[PDB]
Every structure is written in structure tokens, then in C-alpha cells.
Amino acid sequence: WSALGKAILDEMVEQNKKQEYSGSPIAIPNNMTRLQS
């Protein structure tokens, strides 16, 4: 029962991760520097 519950919780937390900020490249780090160009 513990193994099954752990697997279910793992599936749930993984589902919560695949709906995060995924739909985009991880490159081109943002440039939120300042108002001074």
C-alpha cells in the first residue's frame, strides 16, 4: 500500500510539473536589467 501511494503521489507531482513554464525554450536568458540602456 505504501509503494502504491508513493507511486500515485509521484505521478501527481509530476503532472503538476509538466503544466509549468514548459512551452518555451530555456535559452536567451531574460534582460530585465534596468531603465538605463
Binding site: 534582460n31 536589467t33 534596468r34 540602456s37
Partner: protein, 50 residues
Amino acid sequence: PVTAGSSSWVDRTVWESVNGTLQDIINVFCSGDEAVTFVADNQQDSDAAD
């Protein structure tokens, strides 16, 4: 400024060359107290040159 985070610092280069040429230009023509001075080829028309 395509974007705020870019901070697109412009490089004023055309202005630089413009000034570098204009300084020499003025040092060529306007350097002398006078602008030009006519010159003739004979003495019969030299009284009018000056």
C-alpha cells in the same frame, strides 16, 4: 530600443567622421584670413585682379 532589458546603447559613429572631415575642410578653406585671390596672366589686366 527594441526592448527595455536590452539597453541599446547607440554608437555615434557617423557624427564622428562628419566632424573629422569638417574640421579639415574648415582648416583648408576658412583657415586663411581671406577666402580667395584672383590671379591674371598679363600685366594689362593685373590692376583689376586686386
